[PDB]
């Protein structure tokens, strides 16, 4: 474990109320939006001052609230953990609610195609093991339809739309443990058919160790995972490169701009008096092979 990263961080989220951040995006004005257990926050991209809040009490909230930038709108979710109802909102960039709806269950991931088709990973229902990728269109953002059910003992974890007709999903064995099998699978969205599957569990190049988020990058994608590694892949799943590496277990969602990842980070670090604390922050890293290890020396 490392020291609290006051010198390196872009934005200290814990004092702003954005406790346990899970996802972060740039909007079309390059302002920053964070989805956290403490709610949804908008920050000015230049000054980092708070511009808008939809605050929540972080101890009651489910993990993996989502935030997606889509044209001139923000799409975001929250759920109270014990209720297992997800609130889906579409807002203007100034925070005006233009759509609200409710989804039975909890989510792990959400993505949207350029043409506006939304895809979610529904968490497995209590007493079930399999889970589901569902879809509906932003035009009428209700009436979710099944695109795929996981195979028994497996679960979808994260998804990413690679184009209007293509999606990638990460999979792990369910129930999941630190030695659990993992892979990436690819779907054809015109017909909801699996077209490929690559990778496997591990921390060697080309292997995945529990992806936190999958970002579209060129025609392919970059994902991070619990080992701290950012791994780039082609559209067909061919491994390309380790683009960066941070400490393990801190990173959740991230966005990419100008060859740099904007990271949501939360987890254990050592405060100035060597005390263990759970901190929340944003931090950028260049996707040129940079690493927190190297930065150290």
Curated annotation (Swiss-Prot):
It comes from the Eukaryota. This is Uncharacterized protein C45G9.5. The lineage of its organism: Eukaryota, Metazoa, Ecdysozoa, Nematoda, Chromadorea.
């Amino acid at each position: 474990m490392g020291s609290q990263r006051f010198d390196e961080m872009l934005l200290h989220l814990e004092p702003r109320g954005a406790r346990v951040p899970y996802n972060v995006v740039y909007d079309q004005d390059n302002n920053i939006w964070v989805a956290s257990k403490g709610g949804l926050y908008k920050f000015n991209g230049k000054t980092l001052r708070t511009l808008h809040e939809d605050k929540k009490f972080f101890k009651k909230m489910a993990p993996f609230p989502q935030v997606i930038s889509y044209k001139d709108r923000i799409i975001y979710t929250s759920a109270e953990f014990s209720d297992r109802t997800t609130i889906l909102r579409v807002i203007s960039l100034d925070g005006d609610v233009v759509h609200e709806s409710f989804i039975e269950g909890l989510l792990n991931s959400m993505t949207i195609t350029d043409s506006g088709d939304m895809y979610i990973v529904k968490q497995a229902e209590p007493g079930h093991r399999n889970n589901f990728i569902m879809t509906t269109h932003l035009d009428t953002p209700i009436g979710w339809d099944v695109v795929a059910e996981s195979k028994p003992g497996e679960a979808f974890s994260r998804i990413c739309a690679l184009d209007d007709k293509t999606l990638v999903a990460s999979i792990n064995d369910f129930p999941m443990n630190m030695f659990s099998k993992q892979r990436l699978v690819f779907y054809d969205l015109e017909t909801n058919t699996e077209t490929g599957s690559t990778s496997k569990a591990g921390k060697e190049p080309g292997e995945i160790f529990f992806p936190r988020f999958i970002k579209k990058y060129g025609d392919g994608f970059i994902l991070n995972d619990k080992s701290g590694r950012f791994s780039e892949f082609k559209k067909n799943g061919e491994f390309v490169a380790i683009r960066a590496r941070i400490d393990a277990f801190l990173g959740e969602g991230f966005d990419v701009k100008d060859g740099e990842a904007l990271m949501a980070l939360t987890g254990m670090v050592k405060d100035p008096n060597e005390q263990l604390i759970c901190d929340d922050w944003l931090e950028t890293i260049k996707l040129d092979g940079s690493s927190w290890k190297a930065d150290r020396e």
